[PDB]
């Protein structure tokens, strides 16, 4: 099966450069073009350009010329996009996309770039404890986005509401709720797992009756 694995999210300061990667597997690497797409809130989807790993030829959206450079390494089956002279306008989710064939379309999982002078702050994670009972997890005061919230390491997935973060005093805060049968809590454990990539921190917060 064809897969494209992108590099993880990055916090980068204005004026720096960054190189994001897209590792391809499951097909002859040099035979298909890879495109990059920018997805910035309030600006929809924008096509950036593509590279053909067969001959390293590139075509760019004029908007990104002198900003984005695509490269290819055949030995590692990896395509890179480098952005220079970074500004807040470059903050976005970036997708790499392989030319489509019959057995599916092939998008990477996305890389979230945040261009900011603010330093990384890990979240403080607090348990929200009191038929179907609702439990929660308050994920307070972190920077940058994103954070990854799950419950019972992802095996508890139905009845979950993880809300969009809101910015408050230059830090993000979100909460997550889970609804489970009383016959399973507290007799069985319920834990929210909060993973913040920029700080490489993961917290497991067990929800315990007050």
């Amino acid at each position: 099966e064809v897969q494209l694995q992108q590099s993880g999210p990055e916090l980068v300061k204005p004026g720096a450069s960054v190189k994001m990667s897209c590792k391809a597997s499951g097909y002859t690497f040099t035979s298909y073009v890879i495109h990059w797409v920018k997805q910035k809130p309030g600006q929809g989807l924008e096509w950036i350009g593509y590279i053909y790993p067969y001959n390293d030829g590139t075509i760019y959206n004029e908007k990104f010329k002198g900003k984005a450079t695509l490269t290819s390494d055949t030995s590692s089956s990896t395509v890179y996009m480098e952005l220079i002279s970074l500004t807040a306008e470059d903050s976005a989710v970036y997708w790499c996309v392989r030319e489509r064939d019959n057995y599916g379309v092939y998008w990477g999982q996305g890389t979230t770039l945040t261009v900011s002078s603010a330093k990384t702050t890990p979240p403080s994670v607090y348990p929200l404890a009191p038929s179907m009972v609702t439990l929660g997890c308050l994920v307070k005061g972190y920077f940058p986005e994103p954070v990854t919230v799950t419950w019972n390491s992802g095996s508890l997935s139905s009845g979950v509401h993880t809300f969009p973060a809101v910015l408050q005093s230059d830090l993000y805060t979100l909460s997550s709720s889970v609804t489970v049968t009383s016959s399973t809590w507290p007799s069985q454990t319920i834990t929210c797992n909060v993973a913040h990539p920029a700080s490489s921190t993961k917290v497991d917060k067990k929800i315990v009756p007050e």
Partner: protein, 218 residues
Amino acid sequence: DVLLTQTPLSLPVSLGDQASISCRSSQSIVHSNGNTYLEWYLQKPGQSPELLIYKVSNRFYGVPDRFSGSGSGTDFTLKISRVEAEDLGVYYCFQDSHIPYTFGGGTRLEIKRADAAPTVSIFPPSSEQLTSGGASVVCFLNNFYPKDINVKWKIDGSERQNGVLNSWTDQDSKDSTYSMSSTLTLTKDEYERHNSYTCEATHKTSTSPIVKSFNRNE
């Protein structure tokens, strides 16, 4: 460049009904090989776009047959014969006939369904947060419909606006409801100066609220 303009910007549609989205190109997008490379994608929240239709009218394999595309000249149309709850999200047209390749602005399909009252849950500050010197009161208002609902807080029975931040999920792909969180942030000092904390949910249609309360002293 080829500009792609989508109509409407948002499309509310009853479950089981039909839907139609249009996309107009600012110039011709017949590629020099005779084909018209206009595609339709559906993007669900957090996911990558999924291809639905390619070269105007060809359903991609794996795509449900309730989706179809048509058009000619500069007006292209996506039709959904019977909308299902899983079909909500943002639809985009996309052309790769001419460089630079371009996307439409997106059309958000919103499912219409029956009214649903929120399941409301209130949470006092955790001991952990109080030990750190902070005090957030969290109120979940989950799985309600329609999306417009207001939250008001009361401290000791008096309305409280200072320190309230609200957040809404995208429409749920299983039951077509919305959910919302409302977080009241106070200093621990102010939190310990008062006793009763009330989260109150009102629809814009009705004047009858749903309330959840707790008393710090208990």
